[PDB]
Design a protein around this ligand. Structure first.
Ligand code: NA
Ligand code: NA
Ligand SMILES: [Zn+2]
Ligand SMILES: [Zn+2]
Lengths: 405, 403
């Protein structure tokens, strides 16, 4: 039985480099998750991306999971007017992490636009079970988390209102986060109410040095990176990770769903021979080696659609354990062995709804102090209870108290 | 028992006229369904629409259901280049029904842009249980239907590639529909795979004559319209309705979910004092009276979120009866009484998935000849069976055969 589970996640695809990366994953006998920005398909993402559609098709046909990284990676907030050149413009200024989130509603809508463009270039995409663009997402620049009702946490210094995080004079106050960070929090919540889960990362496989020519060549080697993963295992990395803008300060250390698991973040473009260095030639062998020696050490590889285990007939669940079923998260009320007719639902007494959302819903175990949205108003939970059809916040003055607003 | 159930549906909102209509419903003690086009919120729908946001807010706060009629009512297909004036341009030419659907992928995407814009102007909209824009839709111009696996049917002469239905030389051939109609069928399928249901209508509450100086004034009066509804009840209206472009030729007459129900189609704009006539003054009284005399005649009013009854604990179901549960359609396998811990699902033994979709899914009772989509390929169902996790089409050569 294994040491733990590693989840390879690649951000910022689909681009040309993605193709060889995928092939390498297949040769290594592993699946992975790709959080995509569909603007590359439109050829305006300022990358070698003529093979974008090919790379999307390949990822899906190979059984890899596809999740939502938003349409334009929030570049519409890096410029005054978004257009075909905006990607190039933002790379010129290098202001990706400045004012990255502004209008949380418009920024949230970016993910829905991502859905549209993906289904535009590949009309059959929803026929792929491993297509999870409508369920799994990750916020650009941000190590934030919306997994369960009690497993959520934000990147409180992910983005800035002023200076870049490395510029001298940059200041990060977790207790008084930037307006950009606040906006990104709002984005998290909006996605959660739309049924999305969002995940951050435990370690980042990145250049050891971004300041040199050909920075991609400095990607940590396989063995040492495996060391970093070992240390990450059950060590609440998100709180200790560097740099400061990659931290998840209020991460619920020791939360069950996170035990024995390490989420690896990396980027497709780091594996291409191009403007960032000899990524393909130097780094593809590293990816191949890492997978080989990780399996050898007792690790298994899995994808983000399973990070929360999917409910399955015949398996025994303990009271308090979480599962994922038909897009909804549930928490076991009593220990038992699942059978055909006993699946989690809005009326099941064996399970309660534990989505990381804030809209009032059926069969949720609400605690005192909880706040839910309903029919355009906010309501404070005054009495702990399990919600039901008749007990809507606007008719239950004992359970809920309307707020001003 | 009631004589039947009427479902009032209002299309083409939200606009100024919507406000008073809603009030009339509220005064009448009834709920209704509103299929909206959000482009009015952007102020480019060529109507009195400065109170659009107020009207949407109101319909939701009043308990009315909101469904998806697409962002721009497909006006982007009525012009060469869609823009702020396109609504006006299309009303000028009157070419709405020509080339109405072209690229079905884009046209379907319109229904989704609609979601975005609605949530843009009302960020709290998803906190309304009665907001069903992502689940309930209706295609412009089209009396089409995606209800269950066995209850689907298209408006086969709804739109044209050439001539309008009144023009000389016009012919409608249900067996060889126009490219526009074909595209609209594809749109229906795409929405269904995204989890949508779509509904047509049984009668159309419209001007008796569009050719008079104030056509809105000719809206059928309460009594004669109530007669139309009496006639429509349990007599397969979609097949006999006029004009020809409002017909649903292959509508499943007698299908269980359609029994004792009449869906009324009308438009918000028909109840405004403006360019179409004295809609407010002349017609709002017709609406108010109709409700009164309808209830009196023994009808009850309900909304489209219940057209397929929602699964409820304690109720007894017969084998083959359909319910709606958490956005999915289900069919009872045997007669039973619903109980808390045994709800319809992808693993239930009491129910099978009966969504009107074409993508391969769990717990569907597949029949021989059926065609499903999976990982980019189409498969014929060679052996009838109930689907399950392990029996994916690409690994079960007995159950499925690639095309
Ligand atoms: Na979900
Ligand atoms: Na649905
Ligand atoms: Zn990124
Ligand atoms: Zn319409």
């Amino acid at each position: 039985t294994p040491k733990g589970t590693i989840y390879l996640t690649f951000d910022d695809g689909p681009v040309n480099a993605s193709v060889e990366v995928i092939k390498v994953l297949n040769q290594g006998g592993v699946k992975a998750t790709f959080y995509f920005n569909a603007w590359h398909l439109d050829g305006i993402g300022d990358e070698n991306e003529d093979r974008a559609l090919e790379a999307l098709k390949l990822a899906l046909d190979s059984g890899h999971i596809v999740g939502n990284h938003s349409y334009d990676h929030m570049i519409h907030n890096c410029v005054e007017e978004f257009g075909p050149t905006s990607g190039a413009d933002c790379n010129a200024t290098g202001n990706h992490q400045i004012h990255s989130y502004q209008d949380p509603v418009r920024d949230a809508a970016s993910f829905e636009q991502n859905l549209i463009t993906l289904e535009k270039y590949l009309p059959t995409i929803r026929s792929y079970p491993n297509y999870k663009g409508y369920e799994l997402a990750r916020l650009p620049y941000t190590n934030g988390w919306r997994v369960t009702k009690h497993f959520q946490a934000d990147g409180l210094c992910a983005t800035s209102d002023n200076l870049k995080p490395w510029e001298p004079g940059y200041v990060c106050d977790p207790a008084n986060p930037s307006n950009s960070v606040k906006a990104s929090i709002q984005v998290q919540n909006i996605l959660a109410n739309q049924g999305y889960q969002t995940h951050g990362w435990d370690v980042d496989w990145a250049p050891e040095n971004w300041g040199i020519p050909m920075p991609a060549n400095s990607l940590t080697e396989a063995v040492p990176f495996l060391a970093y993963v070992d240390k990450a295992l059950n060590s609440c990395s998100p709180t200790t990770i560097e740099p400061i803008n990659s931290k998840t300060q209020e991460f619920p250390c020791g939360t069950p769903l996170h035990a024995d698991k390490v989420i690896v973040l990396t980027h497709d473009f780091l594996f291409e021979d191009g403007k960032r260095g000899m990524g393909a030639t130097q780094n593809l062998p590293k990816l191949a080696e890492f997978i080989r020696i990780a399996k050898e050490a007792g690790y298994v590889f899995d994808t983000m659609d399973n990070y929360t285990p999917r409910w399955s007939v015949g398996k025994t669940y303990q009271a308090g354990e979480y599962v994922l079923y038909q897009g909804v998260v549930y928490k076991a009320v009593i220990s038992h062995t699942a059978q055909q007719d006993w699946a989690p639902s809005s009326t099941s007494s064996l399970w309660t709804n534990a989505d990381p959302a804030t809209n009032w819903t059926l069969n949720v175990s609400y605690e005192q102090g909880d706040i839910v949205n309903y029919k355009g108003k906010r309501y404070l939970v005054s009495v702990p209870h399990v919600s039901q059809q008749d007990w809507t916040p606007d008719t239950q003055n004992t359970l809920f108290t309307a707020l001003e607003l």
